[PDB]
Structure formats: C-alpha cells, structure tokens
RNA sequence: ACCCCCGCCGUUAGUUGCCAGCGGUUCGGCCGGGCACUCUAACGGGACUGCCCGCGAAAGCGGGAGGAAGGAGGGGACGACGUCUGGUCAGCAUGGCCCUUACGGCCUGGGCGACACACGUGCUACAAUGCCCACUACAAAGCGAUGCCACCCGGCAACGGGGAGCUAAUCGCAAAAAGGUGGGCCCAGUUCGGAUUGGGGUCUGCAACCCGACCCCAUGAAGCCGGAAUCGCUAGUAAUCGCGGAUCAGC
RNA sequence: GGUUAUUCAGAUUAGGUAGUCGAAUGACCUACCU
C-alpha cells in the first residue's frame, strides 16, 4: 500500500510516507502550499510526481527536520524518488537519467584557521 | 619580577579581583586555560607527550 | 504651526515633525501622541486648530526644550570649565570625553584632517 | 557608579571630621582619587596625588558629585 | 541598522536586548 | 587556468518556463544569494509584461536579450611592445553573459523606484530596439568597427 | 529498575567495559537493555602553535569525553554479585543510580 | 596510502523521534505501546580503470551505463636535505657578561588608553533589491556547581526580588537572522546614517575622573558607493545572514 | 576640463634615486643605482 524512501541533505533529513490519494500533502503539519509560502523552489520538489505523471493522485505525509528552510525541500526531492522507486521498479529506468538519485555532496565546508571563511584571506598587503 | 610574581600569584591575600590565572609549569601570566592551569606552549607540548589524557590530535 | 516659539515643523508627519524640533527626539514625539490621542498618521496641513494648540502648548510647557534647553547644555560645560575637571578640560582642547583614541581618528570632534 | 552608598575612603572622612570637630586647617596629602567628595567638605584643600605629586587643588559647591581625580591632572601638557 | 543605538537588530549585534526587543 | 578548458556551469532550468536562459537572468539579479528575492522581482516584471502588452514575457525576454547581444568587441593585446584594441567575434557564451549582465545594469541606472518595474521598463525597451542597456551594446560595437584597423591580429 | 552510566576517554575501553557488563548481567540475571551511547560531548581547544608570534598555522586537539548507557531491570542476586566482583574498570568513570 | 569530519546502506543498543497503526485527546507524541524509521555514536561493506567504446607498446587519456558517490568525490591532520646568520634569553631552560643595602623586594597612585599627524587590518554606513514595526516558520555546534536561569511582580529599560528544575540528547543561555503576511514611509543630509555631546539611571567589583560595558531621554556629526593604487575568491566557494565558545569579576 | 611650475601626502619599489602617478597651492586657458 504505502510508498517510502529517505531524503537527506545538510543534516536536514526527511522521512517520506505516501499512500495513493487525491493530492493532499501534509508534512510536519501544514498543507504543502501553506508551510512553503512565497518561495519559488518549492514547486520543484514535487517534480518526481510530475515525472511519473501523477500530480493529483498521490497524497503524502513527510516528516522533515533539521537543516535550513530550502535544504529541507531538497531532502524532500529525493525521499519521493526513493518512495516511488521502491514500490515501482519501472519508474527508475527513466527517473534516474533525468537525475534525482544523489545525496548531493554539496555540504557547507569547514572554516580553516588563518582564514576567515575556510578561504577568504585577511586583506593582503606589503606596505 | 618573574619569580617574585609567580609566588605572589599563589598568595591571594587581598580582594579576589587579583587572584589572576597563572600557569602551573611555566608560570606564564597570560593564555592560561582554567580547565588545565596550563599555558598554550606547554599544554601543546604536553599534548604531544600524551601526558594530557583523553586529549587527541584534532582533525575533522 | 509655529510650535516651539520659532521652529515650524509643517507639511510633514505629526510624529516626525516633532523630532526635528530641538529638544524633542523620536520618543518624546510618540509621547505627545498617546497623551493627546492624536493619530500619528495625519499631517500638519490638515489638523484641527484645537490640536494646533492642544498638542503644542502640551509639549511646550511639559518639559525642557528649544534654545533654553541648549542653554543648559551650554551651562553644564561652564561648570566643568571654571574649575578644570578631567571631563571639562576636554572641551577646552576640544578632545573627546570618553577617553577614546586620540592617536587614531576621532575627527568628529577634532575637525577635518589638518596634515601639517 | 555606586548608587547605593557613595564610595570613598574612611581615612578621608576621618582626616576631615577631626577637621570640622574644631574647624582645623585644610592641608592634607591624599592617595585616593578613586573617591567621591563628601558634600560638607567644602572650603578644604585636598592635595591630591596623580602619580606625580600633591596638587593644591581647591574645592567648591559645584564639584561635589565628582571624584578627587577629576580635579587632578594625570598627564603633562593637558 | 547593525549600529543604530535604538533598533530591532540594533541590539542583536551588541549582545543585549533592551526596550526595543521582546524580553521575558 | 592553464590545463583544461574548465567547462561551464550547467545551471538548472526554469521553475516556470523550462528554459535555461530564464534562470540565467535571475542569478545576475540575485544579490547575496537570494534566488527567491530575485525570481519574484523578475516574475513581477513578467506580469507587468502582459499588462502594458498582452504579449508573452517569453518572447519579450527572448527579444530583450537578442537586442543587446553584442556581435564583436575590442580586446587589448600586446605585440612585442604595444597595446592594440583588436576587435573580434565574441564567445557564444560571452554574448549572453554580457547582454544579461548589462541588462541588469540598466535596471539600476533608471529613475524607476521599484526594481521589478525597472527590469519591466527595461526588458521592453530592449525588444523594441532602444534602451539604456541596448546603447551600451551599440557602443561596444562602435569601438569594434572604429579600430577595425588592427583586425590583422585575429589570433 | 537500576541504571548505570559509563563516561570515559578511550572508546576501545568503553566498548569493552560496557560489553562485559552486558554479558554478565544477562547470562546470570533477568533482562538488560544493550549499550546506549549518549551524544559524545567533545571539547575543542585551538591555540597558537608558535611560542612567540604567528597568528596562524596554529594547532588544536579534542577531548573525547565519551558516553555510554546500560539499563538492567531485575535486581537479581546473582547479577549484583557478578557486577560487584567481576568488573574490569580502568579509565572509565561509572555512576550507578536506582 | 593506512587517521578523522561529511557524502550510500546495514549490523548493535533503545527515555531521540511516530494520529505514521489502535485507545484517552486537556485534540499537547501528553499516556499506553514499538524501534521497522528520524536520530544518536560505534563497527563494517562500497569505487578497483571493474565494465562496454575508441587512441595506445605499456603507462594512460577521452566517452557511456550501472551507482549515493568515478579517475585524489569534498574537506582536514600531515608540511622533505635545506634556505632565510629569519623569530623568541619575554613561555621556559641555558654558556658568558652585568646589578647584588639595590638593575633585587612591597604597596599606593600614575602610565601602556598621552595626539598637530601618517600607514596597516576592520565594523557600520551613505540607503527604496531597501529604512521602521506587528505576526509567523526553518539551524549546527557549543558550554552550563560557588554556574546557564524557565515562570510572577515593580519600570521606559538595563536590572533587581521571590522561586521550580539541572553531576547535564530530559532543566536553562534559546526569537537562529535574512526571510513569509500586513503598515506607515516617497528620494529627502532623509523614519537612511549613529558619530558626537548634556542630564538621569542599572550591573561587576576594595575602586569605573583618569580608564568599563549597558540602558532611556535629547543632541541627530562625516558621510551621494569614493584618485593613483590596491585585495579576496573557481562552488556550497564569494558575498550575505545569525549562533556558540575559549579568554574572562566585569569588559 | 587643459597647460605649466613647485611642494609633501600618498602611490608603484625589497629599498633608494628619478620618473611616471596621484593630491594640494600659486600662475594660467619605464631609468639608474645599492
Ligand atoms: Mg535508512
Ligand atoms: Mg558558507
Ligand atoms: Mg581578571
Ligand atoms: Mg537517554
Ligand atoms: Mg501503520
Ligand atoms: Mg513494531
Ligand atoms: Mg580525468
Ligand atoms: Mg603526508
Ligand atoms: Mg637576526
Ligand atoms: Mg595595547
Ligand atoms: Mg540634517
Ligand atoms: Mg555640520
Ligand atoms: Mg560564554
Ligand atoms: Mg614612497
Ligand atoms: Mg620612495
Ligand atoms: Mg599643500
Ligand atoms: Zn607553560
């Protein structure tokens, strides 16, 4: 019945429960359009569902936590691929090449000493 | 006044706004951590000697 | 209208206009409003005459302000002056009174960079 | 700032009370500019130190809430 | 302003809260 | 650098039209990494497109770039000991990059109070033919043909 | 019912000391929940490498003050005799509270 | 290269987490229950030119799939024989020199905080991608026994007084900010800018004049994005946005 | 706005010279060297 996967990025994980339904999408409470308000990136996350051609045909109860606002959405992006790839073998043969299955290694980088931002040196001089 | 001041530090006869931190080995007047009673030099050397238990060459 | 005897904060917010008044800042401005129920929104080109005197006479008589205020400002100095406290001999040479770095800048009280 | 209790040394009040107790002179050599001035101690001459020496600085009714060091220069050419 | 002596984030910068900031 | 060609940043398509170019413009508007602030300000002017003209912002943008896309430019070069302003064909990429760049830079010059309104009045005057940003392209195309002399260093 | 804590620096003598405690309590008494490592609260100390002056190229180490947890239910008579006697502490600071 | 952080998953453990499944619902994971999953550390497998294509003698390079991750995936620890007669007798020890009723020793006060200047590193700004204000939402790490302080009263606030819990994934510093909705603002030396300065206050501490921070009121200075020159950075980087700690009476 | 003269304040130099370069004020319309 249910579809599940595990989205994660920037220590902002996201459980993904999703049983076929109308399209309702509670996630940490709040409707989908309710929590994410005035933020364009949101309409992206639900792309895997648009790849399977089932917008208004899958409800979803996702539990995302930690990390910033947007990073969350990214974890959501993958959790859904995993969710709809688990209970669906034939939906990976096309969803993968379009790219969706990758942790996204792009984590913030540690600040190093003798620098201000792991990299940005103090204003060089000679005088 | 380097000996006569490392000794004066162990005294604390007057008000506590004078019981200023001090090193246990060198008697350095500054850069003395409270957790150790040590200064940055030795505490680095001693840390190489392993004589500071638990401590470990940090590398994240 | 001619509020503090000479200053005339017309054609602008009732709240902000009062700030421009010497001796009256932003807080003392929100002060005359709540104590006279005046809406901060409206202007000075369309206010009742009653308030042109109601709000006016209010602050005028309420607390120190205007040239008389400055006089006190100017007076408190002469005291630090006639005797020579460490705070007073700062207005003399014209240095700062916070004991701040005269070595580097401090121009705001010092004046524009005089190279020489 | 010492709102509670007007800070100052006891030897001051002492070396000046015995002064009011018979209206003695006014000479005095202090080493405590860290002290506020006692209201009634007007007319006296406290020769305040300043790392240098004892300045025969006088006193009045205005200079009360102010400290002793206030009226004792600490640096030359100032 | 990060340095206005009477603002919201004015105190968020100087380590304090003050009047212009919801204390407890 | 010196080794490999160090290839481009293949950005993610548009979250509205599904075309690369559109996203590109966003970025150059984006200050301090605020893709949400910029996207709106661009999308705001998208709808200020169907107002002044029932025309679609898709062609008002496509035509707004291709009307400021400089065709050839003056690059300085040494010649044993001299600095000529050699004119030469721009990179397919360089055109877009500069066009889109200037485009934005116009938005700042204008007297318009609100930003999206600036990029609105600008992206139109672009597809028209005349605009503060279009003139910085007619301008670079000038230095182009004027120095046409030293074209014998095409390299 | 009873609860034991296991702080310590070395982690090889903290998977050992908690591991002996798990085999002795279960093998000679009622149930005993396995080892539950608490979030290792680690200290960090960066300091200037140079004796004199070099505001960089400095060094820094970390204090790995570990954490581990084992909870036993039935206060058996065989177990309390097994724990009291049979135990190999070392650089582990345990604290037991009922 | 074997060392650790973050990148995929599992093994072990269940006071972190689930109206996801059922019962109460005060409709609050609060109670019951459970560890599959989030998390917590700890152990381990995984990527090796292994595979197909093409060049090639080999080494290898270039392209495709599978994969979380391909040609060191990202980062850090690491920095050779030496060089600079580089740095430190002031962290410490050490040869030699030199003082030894004082070049040693103690307090009190002064001074490193002196200002006619000049340079270095920086914060904040000159503003409408924005200034002020009411609501609302999302971090990681870190510390907290003479310390972090929830809740209640006085007040304009800093702060104080009473007082619950905490040898600390369970209590506290704790709204993360920018941002989402709504308001005034309308280009102005400006509701931009907070320097300067008058008066009134709180906290630490024998003591805030010299010489502390921190409130509230007022004063609202220079300052329209900067000459010659010149600096950082190739990707989660620059910029931009908040938090913590060490240091520590406080700063 | 340009020309010229000078000056010190910077700037380019490891440094100096000189110069370039910048600024001020009055008048006016890359080179050498240690
Ligand atoms: Mg999993
Ligand atoms: Mg970053
Ligand atoms: Mg101290
Ligand atoms: Mg627990
Ligand atoms: Mg279920
Ligand atoms: Mg179960
Ligand atoms: Mg390669
Ligand atoms: Mg190595
Ligand atoms: Mg030397
Ligand atoms: Mg200093
Ligand atoms: Mg003004
Ligand atoms: Mg002025
Ligand atoms: Mg702290
Ligand atoms: Mg020079
Ligand atoms: Mg020179
Ligand atoms: Mg001159
Ligand atoms: Zn030491």
Swiss-Prot record, chain A:
What GO MF terms are annotated?
A: rRNA binding; structural constituent of ribosome; tRNA binding
InterPro entries given in the database record: Ribosomal_Su5_D2-typ_SF, Ribosomal_uS9, Ribosomal_uS9_bac/plastid, Ribosomal_uS9_CS, Ribsml_uS5_D2-typ_fold_subgr
Cellular component aspect of the GO annotation: cytosolic small ribosomal subunit
What keywords are assigned to this protein? Ribonucleoprotein, Ribosomal protein, RNA-binding, rRNA-binding, tRNA-binding
Output the GO biological process annotations, alphabetical, semicolon-separated: translation
Keyword Plastid in the entry? The reply is: no
Q: What does this protein do?
A: Part of the top of the head of the 30S subunit. The C-terminal region penetrates the head emerging in the P-site where it contacts tRNA.
Record note on quaternary structure:
Part of the 30S ribosomal subunit. Contacts proteins S7 and S10.
What HAMAP family does the record point to?
Answer: Ribosomal_uS9_B
Similarity annotation? Belongs to the universal ribosomal protein uS9 family.
What protein name applies here?
Small ribosomal subunit protein uS9
Q: Source species, please?
A: Thermus thermophilus (strain ATCC BAA-163 / DSM 7039 / HB27)
Q: What is the lineage of its organism?
A: Bacteria, Thermotogati, Deinococcota, Deinococci, Thermales
Q: Which gene encodes it?
A: rpsI
Curated annotation (Swiss-Prot), chain B:
What GO MF terms are annotated?
Answer: rRNA binding; structural constituent of ribosome; zinc ion binding
Alphabetical UniProt keywords? Metal-binding, Ribonucleoprotein, Ribosomal protein, RNA-binding, rRNA-binding, Zinc
A Pfam family annotated for this UniProt entry: Ribosomal_S14
Keyword Signal part of the UniProt annotation: no
**Described purpose of this protein according to its UniProt entry:** Binds 16S rRNA, required for the assembly of 30S particles and may also be responsible for determining the conformation of the 16S rRNA at the A site.
The UniProt subunit note reads as follows: Part of the 30S ribosomal subunit. Contacts proteins S3 and S10.
State the protein's name.
Small ribosomal subunit protein uS14
Lineage, uppermost ranks? Bacteria, Thermotogati, Deinococcota, Deinococci, Thermales
UniProtKB/Swiss-Prot annotation, chain E:
Q: Which Pfam families match?
A: Thx (PF17070)
- What InterPro entries does its record include? Ribosomal_bTHX, Ribosomal_bTHX/bTHXc/bTHXm
Q: Where is this region: Disordered?
A: 1-24
UniProt keywords, alphabetically: Ribonucleoprotein, Ribosomal protein, RNA-binding, rRNA-binding
List all Basic residues biased stretches.
1-12
List cellular component terms (GO). Answer: ribonucleoprotein complex; ribosome
Q: Is Cell cycle among the key words of this record?
A: no
Top-level taxon of origin: Bacteria
UniProt GO molecular function: rRNA binding
Family the UniProt entry places it in: Belongs to the bacterial ribosomal protein bTHX family.
Q: What does this protein do?
A: Binds at the top of the head of the 30S subunit. It stabilizes a number of different RNA elements and thus is important for subunit structure.
Quaternary data: Part of the 30S ribosomal subunit.
Protein name, please? Small ribosomal subunit protein bTHX
UniProtKB/Swiss-Prot annotation, chain F:
Which keywords label this protein? Ribonucleoprotein, Ribosomal protein, RNA-binding, rRNA-binding, tRNA-binding
The UniProt family comment states: Belongs to the universal ribosomal protein uS7 family.
Subunit info here reads: Part of the 30S ribosomal subunit. Contacts proteins S9 and S11.
GO aspect biological process, one term: translation
Q: NCBIfam families from the xrefs?
A: rpsG_bact
What is its biological role? One of the primary rRNA binding proteins, it binds directly to 16S rRNA where it nucleates assembly of the head domain of the 30S subunit. Is located at the subunit interface close to the decoding center, probably blocks exit of the E-site tRNA.
Q: Which Pfam families match?
A: Ribosomal_S7
Q: Which InterPro entries match?
A: Ribosomal_uS7, Ribosomal_uS7_bac/org-type, Ribosomal_uS7_CS, Ribosomal_uS7_dom, Ribosomal_uS7_dom_sf
* CDD domains tied to this protein: uS7_Bacteria
List the record's Gene Ontology CC terms alphabetically. small ribosomal subunit
Report the HAMAP family cross-referenced here. Answer: Ribosomal_uS7_B
Protein name as catalogued: Small ribosomal subunit protein uS7
User: Which species expresses this protein natively?
Assistant: Thermus thermophilus (strain ATCC BAA-163 / DSM 7039 / HB27)
A molecular function (GO) term: structural constituent of ribosome
Instruction: Determine if Nucleus is one of this entry's keywords.
Output: no
Looking up PROSITE patterns in the UniProt record yields: RIBOSOMAL_S7
């Amino acid at each position: 019945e249910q579809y599940y996967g595990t989205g994660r990025r920037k220590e902002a994980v996201a459980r993904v429960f999703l049983r076929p339904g109308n399209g309702k999408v509670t996630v940490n409470g709040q409707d989908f359009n309710e929590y994410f308000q005035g933020l364009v990136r949101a309409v992206a996350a639900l792309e895997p569902l648009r790849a399977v051609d089932a917008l208004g045909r899958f409800d979803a109860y996702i539990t995302v936590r930690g990390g910033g606002k947007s990073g969350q959405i990214d974890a959501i992006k993958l959790g859904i691929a995993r969710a709809l790839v688990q209970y669906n073998p034939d939906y990976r043969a096309k969803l993968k090449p379009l790219g969706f299955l990758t942790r996204d290694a792009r984590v913030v980088e540690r600040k190093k000493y003798g620098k201000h931002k792991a990299r940005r040196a103090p204003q060089y001089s000679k005088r | 006044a380097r000996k006569a001041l490392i000794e004066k530090a162990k005294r604390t006869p007057k008000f506590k706004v004078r019981a200023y931190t001090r090193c246990v080995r060198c008697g350095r007047a500054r850069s003395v951590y409270r957790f150790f009673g040590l200064c940055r030099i030795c505490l680095r050397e001693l840390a190489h000697k392993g004589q500071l238990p638990g401590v470990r060459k940090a590398s994240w | 209208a001619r509020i503090a005897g000479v200053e005339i904060p017309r054609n602008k917010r009732v709240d902000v206009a009062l700030t421009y008044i010497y001796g009256i800042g932003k807080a003392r401005a929100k002060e005359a409003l709540e104590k006279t129920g005046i809406n901060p929104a409206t202007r000075v080109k369309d206010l009742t005459e009653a308030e042109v005197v109601r709000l006016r006479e209010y602050v005028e008589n309420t607390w120190k302000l205007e040239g008389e205020l400055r006089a006190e400002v100017a007076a408190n100095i002469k005291r630090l002056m006639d005797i020579g406290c460490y705070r007073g001999l700062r207005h003399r040479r014209g240095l700062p009174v916070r004991g701040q770095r005269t070595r580097t800048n401090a121009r705001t009280r010092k004046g524009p960079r005089k190279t020489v | 700032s010492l709102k509670k209790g007007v800070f100052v040394d006891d030897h001051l009040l002492e070396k000046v009370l015995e002064l009011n107790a018979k209206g003695e002179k006014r000479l005095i050599k202090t080493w405590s500019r860290r002290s506020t001035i006692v209201p009634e101690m007007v007319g006296h001459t406290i020769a305040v130190y300043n790392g240098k020496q004892h300045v025969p600085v006088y006193i009045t009714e205005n200079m009360v809430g102010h400290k002793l060091g206030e009226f004792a220069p600490t640096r030359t050419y100032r | 302003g990060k340095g206005d002596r009477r603002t919201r984030r004015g105190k968020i910068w100087r380590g304090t809260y003050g009047k212009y900031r919801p204390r407890k | 650098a010196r080794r490999r060609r160090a290839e481009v940043r293949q950005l993610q398509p548009d979250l509205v039209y599904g075309d690369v170019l559109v996203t590109a413009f966003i970025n150059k508007i984006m200050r301090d990494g605020k893709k949400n602030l910029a996207a709106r300000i661009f999308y705001d002017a998208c709808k200020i497109i169907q107002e002044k003209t029932g025309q679609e912002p898709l062609k008002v943008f496509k035509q707004a770039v291709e009307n400021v896309k400089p065709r050839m430019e003056v690059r300085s070069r040494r010649v044993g000991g001299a600095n000529y302003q050699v004119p030469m064909e721009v990179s397919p990429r360089r055109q877009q990059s500069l066009a889109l760049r200037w485009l934005v830079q116009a938005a700042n010059q204008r007297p318009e109070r609100r930003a999206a309104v600036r990029i609105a009045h600008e992206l139109m005057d672009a597809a028209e033919g005349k605009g503060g940003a279009v003139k910085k392209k007619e301008d670079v195309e000038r230095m182009a043909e004027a120095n046409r002399a030293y074209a014998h260093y095409r390299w | 019912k009873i609860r034991i804590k296991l702080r310590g620096f070395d982690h090889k003598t903290l998977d050992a000391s908690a591991q002996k405690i798990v085999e002795a309590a279960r093998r000679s008494g009622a149930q005993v929940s396995g080892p539950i490592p608490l979030p290792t609260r680690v200290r960090r100390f960066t300091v200037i490498r140079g004796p004199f002056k070099h505001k960089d190229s400095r060094e820094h180490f970390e204090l790995r003050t570990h954490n581990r947890l084992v909870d036993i239910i039935n206060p058996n008579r065989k177990t309390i005799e097994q724990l009291m006697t049979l135990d190999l502490p070392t650089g582990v600071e345990i604290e037991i509270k009922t």
